Short mmCIF file of N, CA and C in Angstrom, two decimals:
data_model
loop_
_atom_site.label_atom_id
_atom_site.label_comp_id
_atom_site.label_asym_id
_atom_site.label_seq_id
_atom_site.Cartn_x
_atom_site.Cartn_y
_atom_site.Cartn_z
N UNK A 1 26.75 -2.78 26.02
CA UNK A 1 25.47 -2.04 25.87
C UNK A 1 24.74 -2.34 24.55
N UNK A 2 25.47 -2.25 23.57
CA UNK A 2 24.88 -2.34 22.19
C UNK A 2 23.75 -2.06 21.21
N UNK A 3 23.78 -0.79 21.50
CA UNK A 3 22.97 0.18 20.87
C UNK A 3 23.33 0.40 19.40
N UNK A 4 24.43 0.66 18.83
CA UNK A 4 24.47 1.00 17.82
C UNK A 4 24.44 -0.76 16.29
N UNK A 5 24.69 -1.97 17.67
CA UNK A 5 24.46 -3.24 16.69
C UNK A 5 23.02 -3.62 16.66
N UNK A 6 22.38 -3.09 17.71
CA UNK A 6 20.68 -3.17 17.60
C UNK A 6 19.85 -2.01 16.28
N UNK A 7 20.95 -0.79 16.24
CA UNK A 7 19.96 0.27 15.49
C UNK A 7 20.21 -0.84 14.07
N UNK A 8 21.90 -1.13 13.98
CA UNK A 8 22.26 -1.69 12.94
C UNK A 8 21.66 -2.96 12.11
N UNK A 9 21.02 -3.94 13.07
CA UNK A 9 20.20 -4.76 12.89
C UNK A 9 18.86 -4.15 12.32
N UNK A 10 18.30 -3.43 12.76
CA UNK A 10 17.26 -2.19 12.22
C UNK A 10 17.84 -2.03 11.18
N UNK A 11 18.69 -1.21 10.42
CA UNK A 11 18.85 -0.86 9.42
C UNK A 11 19.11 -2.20 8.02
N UNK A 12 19.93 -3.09 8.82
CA UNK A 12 19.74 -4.36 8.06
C UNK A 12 18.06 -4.55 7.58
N UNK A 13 17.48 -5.02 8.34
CA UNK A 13 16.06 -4.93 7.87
C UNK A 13 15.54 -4.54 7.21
N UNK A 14 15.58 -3.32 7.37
CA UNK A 14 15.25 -2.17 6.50
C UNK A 14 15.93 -1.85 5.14
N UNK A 15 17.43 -2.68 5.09
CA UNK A 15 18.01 -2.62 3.46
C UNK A 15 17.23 -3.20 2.47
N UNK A 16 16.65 -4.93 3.39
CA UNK A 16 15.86 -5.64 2.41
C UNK A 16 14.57 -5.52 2.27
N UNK A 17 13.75 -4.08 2.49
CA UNK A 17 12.22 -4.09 1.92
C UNK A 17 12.41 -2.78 1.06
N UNK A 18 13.64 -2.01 1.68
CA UNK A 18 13.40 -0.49 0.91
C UNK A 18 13.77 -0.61 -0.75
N UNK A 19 14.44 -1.46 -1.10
CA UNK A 19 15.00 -1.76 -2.61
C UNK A 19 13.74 -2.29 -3.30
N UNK A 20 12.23 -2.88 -2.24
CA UNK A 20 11.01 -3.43 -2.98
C UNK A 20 10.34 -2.19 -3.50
N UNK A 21 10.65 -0.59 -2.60
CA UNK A 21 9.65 -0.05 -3.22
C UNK A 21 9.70 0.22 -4.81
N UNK A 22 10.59 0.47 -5.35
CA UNK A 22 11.07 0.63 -6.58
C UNK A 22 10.33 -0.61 -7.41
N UNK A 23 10.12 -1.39 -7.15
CA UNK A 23 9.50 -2.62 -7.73
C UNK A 23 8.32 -2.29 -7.77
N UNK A 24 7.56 -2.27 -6.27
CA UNK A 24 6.23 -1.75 -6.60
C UNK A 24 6.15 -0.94 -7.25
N UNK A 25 6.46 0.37 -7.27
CA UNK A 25 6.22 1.69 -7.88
C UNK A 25 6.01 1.49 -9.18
N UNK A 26 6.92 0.59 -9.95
CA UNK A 26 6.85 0.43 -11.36
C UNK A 26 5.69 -0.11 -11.81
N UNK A 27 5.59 -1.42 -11.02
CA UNK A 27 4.31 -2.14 -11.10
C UNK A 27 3.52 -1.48 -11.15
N UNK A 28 2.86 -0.44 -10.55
CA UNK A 28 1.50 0.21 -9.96
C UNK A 28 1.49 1.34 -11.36
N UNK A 29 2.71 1.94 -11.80
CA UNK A 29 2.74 2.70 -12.92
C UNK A 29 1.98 2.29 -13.65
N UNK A 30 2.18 0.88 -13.97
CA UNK A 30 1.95 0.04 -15.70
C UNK A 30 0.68 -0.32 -15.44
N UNK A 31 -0.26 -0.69 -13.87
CA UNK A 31 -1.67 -0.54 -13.65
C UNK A 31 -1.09 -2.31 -13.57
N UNK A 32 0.04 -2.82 -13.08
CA UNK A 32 0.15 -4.52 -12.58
C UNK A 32 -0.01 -4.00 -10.98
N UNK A 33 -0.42 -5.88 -10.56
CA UNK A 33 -0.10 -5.68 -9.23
C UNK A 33 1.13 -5.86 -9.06
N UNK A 34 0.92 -6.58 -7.95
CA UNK A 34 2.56 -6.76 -7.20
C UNK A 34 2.36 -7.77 -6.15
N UNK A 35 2.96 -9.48 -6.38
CA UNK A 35 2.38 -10.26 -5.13
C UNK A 35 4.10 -10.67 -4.66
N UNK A 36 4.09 -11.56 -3.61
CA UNK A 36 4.88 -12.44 -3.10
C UNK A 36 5.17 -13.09 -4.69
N UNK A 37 6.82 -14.07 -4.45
CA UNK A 37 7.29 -14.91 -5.54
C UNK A 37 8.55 -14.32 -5.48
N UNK A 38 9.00 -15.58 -6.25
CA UNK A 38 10.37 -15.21 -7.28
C UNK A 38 10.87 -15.72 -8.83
N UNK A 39 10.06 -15.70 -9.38
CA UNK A 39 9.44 -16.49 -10.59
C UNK A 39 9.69 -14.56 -10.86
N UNK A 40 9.09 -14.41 -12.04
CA UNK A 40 9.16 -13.30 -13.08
C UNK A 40 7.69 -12.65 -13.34
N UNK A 41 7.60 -11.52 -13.62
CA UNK A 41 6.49 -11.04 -13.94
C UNK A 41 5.37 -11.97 -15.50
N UNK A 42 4.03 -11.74 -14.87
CA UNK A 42 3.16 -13.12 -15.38
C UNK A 42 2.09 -12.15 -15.81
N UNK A 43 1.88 -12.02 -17.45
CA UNK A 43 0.86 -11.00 -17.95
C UNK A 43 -0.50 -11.72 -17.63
N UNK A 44 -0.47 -12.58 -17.70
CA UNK A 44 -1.72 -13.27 -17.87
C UNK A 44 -2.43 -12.60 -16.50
N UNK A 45 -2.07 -12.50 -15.54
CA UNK A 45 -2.80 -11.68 -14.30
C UNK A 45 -2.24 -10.14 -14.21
N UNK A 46 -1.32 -10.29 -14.81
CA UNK A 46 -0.28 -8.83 -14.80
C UNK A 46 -0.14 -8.44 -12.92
N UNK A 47 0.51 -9.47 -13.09
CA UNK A 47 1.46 -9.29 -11.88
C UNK A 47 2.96 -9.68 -11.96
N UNK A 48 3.50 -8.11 -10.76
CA UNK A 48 4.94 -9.06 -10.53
C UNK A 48 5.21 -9.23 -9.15
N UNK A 49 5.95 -10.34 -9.19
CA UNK A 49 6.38 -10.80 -7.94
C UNK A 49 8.06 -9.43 -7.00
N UNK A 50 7.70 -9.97 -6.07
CA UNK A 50 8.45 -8.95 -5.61
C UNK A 50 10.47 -9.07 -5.80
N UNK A 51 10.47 -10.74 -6.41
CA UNK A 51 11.61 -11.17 -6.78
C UNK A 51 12.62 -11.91 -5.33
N UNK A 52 12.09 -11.59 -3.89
CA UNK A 52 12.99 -11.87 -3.12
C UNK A 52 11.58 -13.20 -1.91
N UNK A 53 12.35 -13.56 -1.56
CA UNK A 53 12.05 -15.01 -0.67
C UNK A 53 11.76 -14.50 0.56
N UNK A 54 10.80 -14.88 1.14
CA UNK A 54 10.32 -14.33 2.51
C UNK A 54 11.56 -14.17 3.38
N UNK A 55 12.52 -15.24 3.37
CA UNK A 55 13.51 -15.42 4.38
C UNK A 55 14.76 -15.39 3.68
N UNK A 56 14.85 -14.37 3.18
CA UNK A 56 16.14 -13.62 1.93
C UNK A 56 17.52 -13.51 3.31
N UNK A 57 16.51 -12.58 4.34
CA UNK A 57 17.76 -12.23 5.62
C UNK A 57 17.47 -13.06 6.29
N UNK A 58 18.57 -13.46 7.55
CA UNK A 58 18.24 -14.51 8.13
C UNK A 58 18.03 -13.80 9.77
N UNK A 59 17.84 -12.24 9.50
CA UNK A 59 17.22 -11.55 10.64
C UNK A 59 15.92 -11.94 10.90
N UNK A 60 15.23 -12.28 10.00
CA UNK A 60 13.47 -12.38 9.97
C UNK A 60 13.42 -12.54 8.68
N UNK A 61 11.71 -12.14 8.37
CA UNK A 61 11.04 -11.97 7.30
C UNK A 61 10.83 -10.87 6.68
N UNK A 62 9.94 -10.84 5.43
CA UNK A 62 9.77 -9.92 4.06
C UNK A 62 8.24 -10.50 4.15
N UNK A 63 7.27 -9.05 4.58
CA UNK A 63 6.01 -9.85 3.85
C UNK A 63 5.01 -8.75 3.40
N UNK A 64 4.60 -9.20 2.28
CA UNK A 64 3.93 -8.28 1.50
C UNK A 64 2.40 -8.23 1.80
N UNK A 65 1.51 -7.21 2.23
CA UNK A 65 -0.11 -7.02 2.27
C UNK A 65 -0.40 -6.29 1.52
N UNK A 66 -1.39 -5.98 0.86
CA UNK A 66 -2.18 -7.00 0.63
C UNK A 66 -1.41 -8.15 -0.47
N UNK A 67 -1.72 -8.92 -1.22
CA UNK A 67 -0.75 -10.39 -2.08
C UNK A 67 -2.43 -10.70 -2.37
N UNK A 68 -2.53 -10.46 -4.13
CA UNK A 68 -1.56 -9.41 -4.93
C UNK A 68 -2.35 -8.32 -3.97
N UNK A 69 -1.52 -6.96 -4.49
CA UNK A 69 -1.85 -5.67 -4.14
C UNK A 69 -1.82 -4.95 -5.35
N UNK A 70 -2.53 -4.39 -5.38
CA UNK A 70 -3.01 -3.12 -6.97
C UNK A 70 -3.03 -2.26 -7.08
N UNK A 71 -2.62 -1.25 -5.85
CA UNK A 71 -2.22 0.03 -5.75
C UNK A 71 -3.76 1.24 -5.13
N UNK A 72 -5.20 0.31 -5.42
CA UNK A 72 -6.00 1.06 -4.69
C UNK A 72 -6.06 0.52 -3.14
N UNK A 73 -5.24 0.16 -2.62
CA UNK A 73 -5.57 -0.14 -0.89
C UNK A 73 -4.55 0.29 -0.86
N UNK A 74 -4.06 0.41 0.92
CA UNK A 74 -2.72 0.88 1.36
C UNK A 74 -1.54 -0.57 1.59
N UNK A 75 -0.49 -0.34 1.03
CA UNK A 75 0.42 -1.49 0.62
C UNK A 75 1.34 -1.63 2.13
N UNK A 76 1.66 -2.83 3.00
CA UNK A 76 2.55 -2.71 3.18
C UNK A 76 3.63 -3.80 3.35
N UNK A 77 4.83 -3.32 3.26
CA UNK A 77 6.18 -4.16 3.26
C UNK A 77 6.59 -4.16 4.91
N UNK A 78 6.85 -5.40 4.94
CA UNK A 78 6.86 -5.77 6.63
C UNK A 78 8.36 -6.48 6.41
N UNK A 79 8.99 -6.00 7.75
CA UNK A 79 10.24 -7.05 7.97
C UNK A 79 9.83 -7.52 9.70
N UNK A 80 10.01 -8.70 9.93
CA UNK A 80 9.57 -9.16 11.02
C UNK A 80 11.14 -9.82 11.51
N UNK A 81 11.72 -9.32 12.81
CA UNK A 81 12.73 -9.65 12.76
C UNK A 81 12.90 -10.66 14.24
N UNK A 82 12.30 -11.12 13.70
CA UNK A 82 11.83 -12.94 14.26
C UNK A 82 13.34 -13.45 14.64
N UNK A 83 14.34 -13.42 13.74
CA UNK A 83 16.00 -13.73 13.89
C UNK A 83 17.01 -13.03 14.75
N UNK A 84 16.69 -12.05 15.43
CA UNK A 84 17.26 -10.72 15.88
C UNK A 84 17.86 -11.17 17.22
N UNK A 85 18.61 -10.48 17.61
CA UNK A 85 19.41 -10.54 18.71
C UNK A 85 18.19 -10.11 20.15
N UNK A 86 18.49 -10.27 21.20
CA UNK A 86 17.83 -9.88 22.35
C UNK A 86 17.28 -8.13 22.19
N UNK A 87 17.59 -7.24 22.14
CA UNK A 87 17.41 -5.92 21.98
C UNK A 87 15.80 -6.07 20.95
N UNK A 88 16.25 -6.71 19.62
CA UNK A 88 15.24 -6.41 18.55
C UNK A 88 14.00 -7.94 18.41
N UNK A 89 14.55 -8.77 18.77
CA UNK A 89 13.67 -10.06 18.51
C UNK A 89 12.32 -9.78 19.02
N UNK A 90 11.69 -10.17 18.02
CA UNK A 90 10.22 -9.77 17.68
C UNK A 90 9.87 -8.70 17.19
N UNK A 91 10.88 -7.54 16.62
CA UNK A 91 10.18 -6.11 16.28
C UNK A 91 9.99 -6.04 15.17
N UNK A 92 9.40 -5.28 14.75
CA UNK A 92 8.88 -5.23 12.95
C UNK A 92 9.23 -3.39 12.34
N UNK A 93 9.61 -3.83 11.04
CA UNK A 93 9.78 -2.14 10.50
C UNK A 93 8.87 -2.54 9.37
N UNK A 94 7.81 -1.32 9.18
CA UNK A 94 7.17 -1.53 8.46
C UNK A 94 6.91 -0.60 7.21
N UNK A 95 7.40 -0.78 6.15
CA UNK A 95 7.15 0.63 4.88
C UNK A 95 5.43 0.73 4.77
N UNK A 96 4.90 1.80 4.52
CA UNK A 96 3.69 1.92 4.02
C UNK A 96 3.19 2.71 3.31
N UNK A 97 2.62 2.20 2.02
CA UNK A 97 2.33 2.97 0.62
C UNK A 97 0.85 3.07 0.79
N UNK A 98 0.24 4.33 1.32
CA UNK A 98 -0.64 4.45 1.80
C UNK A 98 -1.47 4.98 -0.25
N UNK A 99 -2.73 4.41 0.03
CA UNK A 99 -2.97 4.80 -1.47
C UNK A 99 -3.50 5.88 -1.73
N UNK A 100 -4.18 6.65 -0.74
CA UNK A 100 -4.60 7.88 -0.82
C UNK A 100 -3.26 9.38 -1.58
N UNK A 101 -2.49 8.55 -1.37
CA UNK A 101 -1.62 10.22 -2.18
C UNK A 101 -0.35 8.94 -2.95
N UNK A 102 -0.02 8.10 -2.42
CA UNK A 102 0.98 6.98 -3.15
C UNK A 102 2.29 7.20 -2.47
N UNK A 103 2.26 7.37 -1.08
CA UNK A 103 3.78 7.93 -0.41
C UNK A 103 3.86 6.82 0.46
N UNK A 104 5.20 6.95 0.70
CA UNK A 104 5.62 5.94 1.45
C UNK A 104 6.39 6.55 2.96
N UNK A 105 6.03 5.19 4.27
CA UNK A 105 6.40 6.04 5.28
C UNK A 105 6.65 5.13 6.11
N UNK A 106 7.93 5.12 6.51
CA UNK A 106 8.76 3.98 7.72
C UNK A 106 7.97 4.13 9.39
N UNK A 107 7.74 3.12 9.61
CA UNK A 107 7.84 3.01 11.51
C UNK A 107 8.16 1.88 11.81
N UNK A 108 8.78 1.84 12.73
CA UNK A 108 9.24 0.42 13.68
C UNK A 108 8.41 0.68 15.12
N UNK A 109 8.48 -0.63 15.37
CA UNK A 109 8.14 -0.54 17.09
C UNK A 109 9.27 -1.28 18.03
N UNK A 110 10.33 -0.65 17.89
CA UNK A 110 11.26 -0.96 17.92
C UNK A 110 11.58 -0.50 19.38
N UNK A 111 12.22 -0.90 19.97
CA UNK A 111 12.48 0.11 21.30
C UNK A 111 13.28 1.41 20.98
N UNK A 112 12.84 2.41 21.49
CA UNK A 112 12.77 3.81 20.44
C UNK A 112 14.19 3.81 20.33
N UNK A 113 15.03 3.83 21.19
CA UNK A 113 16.77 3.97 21.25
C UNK A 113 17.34 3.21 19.88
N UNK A 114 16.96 2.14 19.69
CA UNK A 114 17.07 1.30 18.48
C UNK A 114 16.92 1.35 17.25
N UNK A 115 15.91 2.59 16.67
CA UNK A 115 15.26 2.78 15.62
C UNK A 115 16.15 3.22 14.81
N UNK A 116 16.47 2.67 13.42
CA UNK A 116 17.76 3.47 12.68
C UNK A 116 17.63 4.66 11.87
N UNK A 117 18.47 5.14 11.36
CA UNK A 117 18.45 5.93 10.69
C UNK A 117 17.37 5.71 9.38
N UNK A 118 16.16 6.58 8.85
CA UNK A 118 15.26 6.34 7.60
C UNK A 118 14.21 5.70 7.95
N UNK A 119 14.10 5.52 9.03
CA UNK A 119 12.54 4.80 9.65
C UNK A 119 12.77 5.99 11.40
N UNK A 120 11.23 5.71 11.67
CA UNK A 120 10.96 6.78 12.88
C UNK A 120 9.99 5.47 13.68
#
């Protein structure tokens, strides 16, 4: 059946964007953006990169909107799980740092049975 290696694949996903918000957050504190890279934070534009490689997991992708992003639009961190087993291939979990209040808020479109724990 494999329900609980599909939510699990979900939650994989979801390990490698939720450790970005902390990155952004800082960024957006200090008034930097925050783009794609893995190179080091660069004053000269005052940006930092998010430190991890689009294809870090080999479930899918990591992709950042807007690149750079500056904290007045709504931010979001995408995992596209392009790599995924039959159950999840093609679904996306998506964080979103909406800029109107600065909160952040999980959804997948996941087939609902699948959705893991910390995303809805």
């Amino acid at each position: 059946e494999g329900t609980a290696f599909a939510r699990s694949e979900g939650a994989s996903a979801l390990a490698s964007v939720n450790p970005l918000k902390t990155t952004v957050e800082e960024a957006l504190s200090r008034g930097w953006s925050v783009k794609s890279g893995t190179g080091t934070e660069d004053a000269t534009k005052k940006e930092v990169p998010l430190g991890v490689a689009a294809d870090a997991n080999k479930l899918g992708t990591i992709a950042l909107k807007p690149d750079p992003a500056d904290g007045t639009a709504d931010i979001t961190l995408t995992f596209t799980m392009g790599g995924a087993g039959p159950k999840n291939k093609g679904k996306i979990i998506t964080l979103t740092r909406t800029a109107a209040d600065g909160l952040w808020k999980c959804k997948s479109d996941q087939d609902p049975q699948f959705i893991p724990k910390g995303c809805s």
